[PDB]
Design an enzyme around this catalytic site. Structure first.
Site, PDB file in Angstrom:
ATOM      1  N   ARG A  89       7.264   4.395 -42.494  1.00 58.78           N
ATOM      2  CA  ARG A  89       6.536   3.273 -43.116  1.00 58.78           C
ATOM      3  C   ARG A  89       6.218   3.400 -44.583  1.00 58.78           C
ATOM      4  O   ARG A  89       5.685   2.457 -45.168  1.00 58.78           O
ATOM      5  CB  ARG A  89       5.249   2.961 -42.349  1.00 58.78           C
ATOM      6  CG  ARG A  89       5.492   2.322 -40.983  1.00 58.78           C
ATOM      7  CD  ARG A  89       4.181   2.153 -40.281  1.00 58.78           C
ATOM      8  NE  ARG A  89       3.764   3.381 -39.585  1.00 58.78           N
ATOM      9  CZ  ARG A  89       2.558   3.567 -39.074  1.00 58.78           C
ATOM     10  NH1 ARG A  89       1.635   2.607 -39.216  1.00 58.78           N
ATOM     11  NH2 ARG A  89       2.266   4.712 -38.421  1.00 58.78           N
ATOM     12  N   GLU A 146      16.796  11.918 -34.083  1.00 54.79           N
ATOM     13  CA  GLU A 146      17.044  10.816 -33.154  1.00 54.79           C
ATOM     14  C   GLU A 146      18.411  10.967 -32.458  1.00 54.79           C
ATOM     15  O   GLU A 146      18.529  10.741 -31.240  1.00 54.79           O
ATOM     16  CB  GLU A 146      16.995   9.473 -33.881  1.00 54.79           C
ATOM     17  CG  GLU A 146      15.613   9.134 -34.398  1.00 54.79           C
ATOM     18  CD  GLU A 146      15.591   7.743 -35.033  1.00 54.79           C
ATOM     19  OE1 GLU A 146      15.435   6.753 -34.274  1.00 54.79           O
ATOM     20  OE2 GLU A 146      15.718   7.652 -36.273  1.00 54.79           O
ATOM     21  N   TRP A 196      17.243   3.373 -41.457  1.00 51.41           N
ATOM     22  CA  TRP A 196      18.252   4.432 -41.423  1.00 51.41           C
ATOM     23  C   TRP A 196      17.736   5.512 -40.496  1.00 51.41           C
ATOM     24  O   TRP A 196      16.534   5.544 -40.181  1.00 51.41           O
ATOM     25  CB  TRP A 196      18.536   4.986 -42.813  1.00 51.41           C
ATOM     26  CG  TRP A 196      17.318   5.365 -43.635  1.00 51.41           C
ATOM     27  CD1 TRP A 196      16.562   6.509 -43.505  1.00 51.41           C
ATOM     28  CD2 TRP A 196      16.744   4.622 -44.712  1.00 51.41           C
ATOM     29  NE1 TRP A 196      15.550   6.511 -44.449  1.00 51.41           N
ATOM     30  CE2 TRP A 196      15.638   5.369 -45.198  1.00 51.41           C
ATOM     31  CE3 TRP A 196      17.046   3.386 -45.314  1.00 51.41           C
ATOM     32  CZ2 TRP A 196      14.838   4.922 -46.272  1.00 51.41           C
ATOM     33  CZ3 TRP A 196      16.251   2.950 -46.398  1.00 51.41           C
ATOM     34  CH2 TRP A 196      15.178   3.712 -46.861  1.00 51.41           C
ATOM     35  N   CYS A 215       6.132   4.250 -35.992  1.00 50.69           N
ATOM     36  CA  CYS A 215       7.196   4.408 -36.951  1.00 50.69           C
ATOM     37  C   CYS A 215       6.820   5.419 -38.020  1.00 50.69           C
ATOM     38  O   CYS A 215       5.834   5.222 -38.749  1.00 50.69           O
ATOM     39  CB  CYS A 215       7.536   3.029 -37.592  1.00 50.69           C
ATOM     40  SG  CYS A 215       8.799   3.148 -38.855  1.00 50.69           S
TER      41      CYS A 215
END
Ligand code: HEM
Ligand code: HEM
Ligand SMILES: C[C@H](O)[C@H](O)[C@H]1CNc2nc(N)[nH]c(=O)c2N1
Ligand SMILES: C[C@H](O)[C@H](O)[C@H]1CNc2nc(N)[nH]c(=O)c2N1
Ligand SMILES: CCSCCC(=N)NCCC[C@H](N)C(=O)O
Ligand SMILES: CCSCCC(=N)NCCC[C@H](N)C(=O)O
Ligand SMILES: [Zn+2]
Lengths: 409, 411
Positions: free
Chosen positions: A111, A285, A280, A108
């Site tokens: 973070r 992506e 979000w 991720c």
């Protein structure tokens, strides 16, 4: 034992010691690196050391390690496991656990945000109808009319393994996919199998390009049930381009809330098999992966054609040109509708700052370079130049088998 | 055992058995992955098995395994090692070995070409002057007036470690970098330390933005000597853009011949510490890394300024837009000048075909995804979606310490 990581752009060298607290295995060995591979009940015996390890980390974090309250909690949990074969987390421990599972998520990039997670305790949920209510409330809280807020909703832990809670959907909000007689796919090809399961379970499908999938919820090991998210709770953004008038005519849109719903949360040996969580979007992506993957909406060709690019030769870089424009349109459209989104430059810049904080305060930061580097313009983001060590700390988010492969009806 | 790798775009699954032939280590453990880390005198005792396993591989490749020629060759090498502590490769074995180090190079996206390698045997070289001549001939051959040909030149192997042949340059052709008293850099910041050494050794630096470095060459463990590559042998390309006429006025150029000169070639336990090799460029190496890295020529801002992109916020994707235009210009320039280059789409597509062929014929293809995936537009190339396994086979190319860190100066 002490490991160094170097940034090749800045020459800054950091020392990792946190990896020594590493519990789970990586898939790699001394002979083979499996770093690019996507996918590489606890007995009384197994459970107590896991609870101890977690409780120790918890009591450390509030500066009460070795205290009366630490020792009394360990005894209480030991007694509970010996008597009941499991144990229950205090609300404080559940909140700490969920936040740290995010903190430990090596894939991720977001973070830096880890300590600002709203945790919804749904351990009192008993029915699929209860699950649906909790999830709608998560959706509304997290969406917050476009000002997105990170959230997780945690349903009851695994017991004997026969009474699992599971969200069958891979994200709370996703679009259906349908194999056509034509041979082409309508909608999102990623979701063809799940849409088939929904239809077979009785969903009446609209059979369009962007149909929001119903939720298929499983409580207490029961057969899963279907629920439709209220349409007015699903915020969506039509995609347009700041310069290209014709872009809007492609008829694209996407949803505002990315909420992963198929992962397992492990805290202190306990397993939370339904724990949907959301943040979000980073624009790549949607614009790179969801829109331009060959096995997804695959729109590169159509956009390139509208731009009147020379498509005869790879070396004109027409694919790269169209890619940047699609990603410009995604960010512009979300920003114009005041829906939270982050671009890959800003997100990766943040992660670097986060990594530096984590090295100074915690002795390291597990990070999977293959996932952290954005799927476009990699070397013009700072993470490309950053060596990262990947290792698995608990509490953790883990993959789990799709439930249709496991569930007995 | 069998290991499977999946392509997430096609759902093609390949099975790897070749990893069973890997002996060397990766840096990874069951507990830590070191996949993104850039850098993670042999006894007679260790030398004969390495020799034997290499000669077994060679003889199998020629369908002569266990022949009298094979057995006689093992006996000959065994006796040569017992009496001299080393051995000499036959020309055929050296060619096979260099080809295989390339085949095995997990960071190389161009390996479809591995069986087409011109091997220059320079093991008769004794002096730095002789090195210079060999390297000029490699440059001319590999350049071929723009129709580039892959080549390697192999200088004598290590003996006691006190007589090593080394090319101190990182590539045969690179541009000087000069740190200024104001902290700015003229030329290529990657080459500042090496430029400082060249000047210290006597190089008269022109002090410009694209000055070709002199070669600094060490033979038989002696102190290195400076040589200038004849300018007429150094093919260069002025950079211009097919649509933007102002691009040429950035004053950019690059050299045609990328030739890595600082790696070590291991064949059968023998160590070739000076083994320059060359292919041709993939355009992103120049356009993304060499021009657009913050720590290299760093031109993104200047290009975006000229395009009149909105630079107030990163989310207009101005860096991304300028990046594509620069890479278009590199490919256009080289193609217009008939200098071999390959785009990252072509190169990655060919690599996937090579990888699938290798799995089928050889049982695997070790590959380092971190290196194979291009530094721009990763997921629109098929390698981004391909699982890869990284492991180390011999023969191999290895990194070695920079020679200014280890050289014993004679005076
Ligand atoms: C706050 C904004 C956030 C941002 C910008 C962000 C960013 C990202 C991105 C870009 C990915 C890669 C996803 C993919 O390629 O499919 C990712 C993966 C992931 N994130 Fe986040 N994240 C955020 C919040 C969260 C939260 C709130 C959690 C948990 C509470 C979380 C945990 C994870 C996990 C476990 C993965 C790996 C998912 C997978 O393996 O498919 N993230 N994140
Ligand atoms: C024929 C055309 C070739 C192409 C298109 C090509 C492509 C590439 C590229 C793009 C890289 C990464 C370079 C970087 O990021 O610095 C690379 C690395 C490498 N290639 Fe090739 N290559 C070719 C020929 C060769 C040859 C002839 C050899 C040896 C005989 C070779 C062996 C290697 C090795 C050992 C590396 C890793 C270098 C390092 O770690 O710094 N390649 N290749
Ligand atoms: C095969 C390879 O591991 C796979 O394509 C990965 C690469 N990197 C990724 N990175 C992110 N963030 N998300 C992904 O889905 C992937 N896919
Ligand atoms: C830290 C990281 O491994 C480093 O920046 C790598 C990433 N991938 C690369 N890939 C190639 N081909 N060449 C490189 O120099 C690098 N650099
Ligand atoms: C929920 C944990 S990460 C925070 C949300 C997010 N930024 N991505 C989630 C995955 C979305 C998927 N890649 C998609 O393109 O739909
Ligand atoms: C010589 C072995 S690989 C084939 C040549 C090549 N395509 N690149 C070599 C590295 C060049 C470096 N990245 C640069 O941009 O100068
Ligand atoms: Zn690894």
């Amino acid at each position: 034992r002490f490991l160094k990581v170097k940034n090749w752009e800045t020459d800054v060298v950091l020392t990792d010691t946190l990896h020594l607290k590493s519990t789970l295995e990586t898939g790699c060995t001394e002979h083979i690196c499996m770093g690019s591979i996507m996918l590489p009940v606890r007995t009384k015996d197994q459970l107590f050391p896991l609870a101890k390890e977690f409780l120790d980390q918890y009591y450390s974090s509030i500066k009460r390690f070795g205290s009366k309250a630490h020792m009394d909690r360990l005894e209480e949990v030991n007694k509970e496991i010996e008597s009941t074969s499991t144990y229950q987390l205090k609300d404080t421990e559940l909140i700490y656990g969920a936040k740290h599972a995010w903190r430990n998520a090596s894939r991720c990039v977001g973070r830096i945000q880890w300590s600002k997670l709203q945790v919804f305790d749904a351990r009192d949920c008993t029915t699929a109808h209860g699950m649906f209510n909790y999830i709608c409330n998560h959706v509304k809280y997290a969406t917050n009319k476009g000002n997105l807020r990170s959230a997780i909703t945690i349903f009851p832990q695994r017991t004997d393994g026969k009474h699992d809670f599971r969200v069958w959907n891979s994200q709370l909000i996703r679009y259906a996919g349908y194999k056509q007689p034509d041979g082409s796919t309508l909608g999102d090809p990623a979701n063809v199998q799940f849409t088939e399961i929904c239809i077979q379970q009785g969903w009446k499908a609209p059979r369009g390009r962007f149909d929001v999938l119903p939720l298929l919820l499983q409580a207490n090991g029961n057969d899963p049930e279907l629920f439709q998210i209220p349409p007015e709770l699903v915020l969506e953004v039509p995609i347009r381009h700041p310069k290209f008038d014709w872009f809007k005519d492609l008829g694209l849109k996407w949803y505002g809330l990315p909420a992963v719903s198929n992962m397992l949360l492990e805290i202190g040996g306990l397993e939370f098999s339904a724990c949907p969580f959301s943040g979000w979007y980073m624009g790549t992506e949607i614009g790179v992966r969801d829109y331009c993957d060959n096995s997804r909406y695959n729109i590169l060709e159509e956009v390139a054609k509208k731009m009147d690019l020379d498509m005869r030769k790879t070396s004109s870089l027409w694919k790269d040109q169209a890619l940047v424009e699609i990603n410009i349109a995604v960010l512009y459209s979300f920003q114009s509708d005041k829906v939270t989104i982050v671009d890959h430059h800003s997100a990766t810049e943040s992660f670097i700052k986060h990594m530096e904080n984590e090295y100074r305060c915690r002795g390291g930061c597990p990070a999977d370079w293959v996932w952290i580097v954005p799927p476009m313009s990699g070397s013009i983001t700072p993470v490309f130049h950053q060596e990262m060590l990947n290792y698995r700390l608990t509490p953790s988010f883990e993959y789990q088998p799709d439930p249709w492969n496991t569930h007995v009806w």
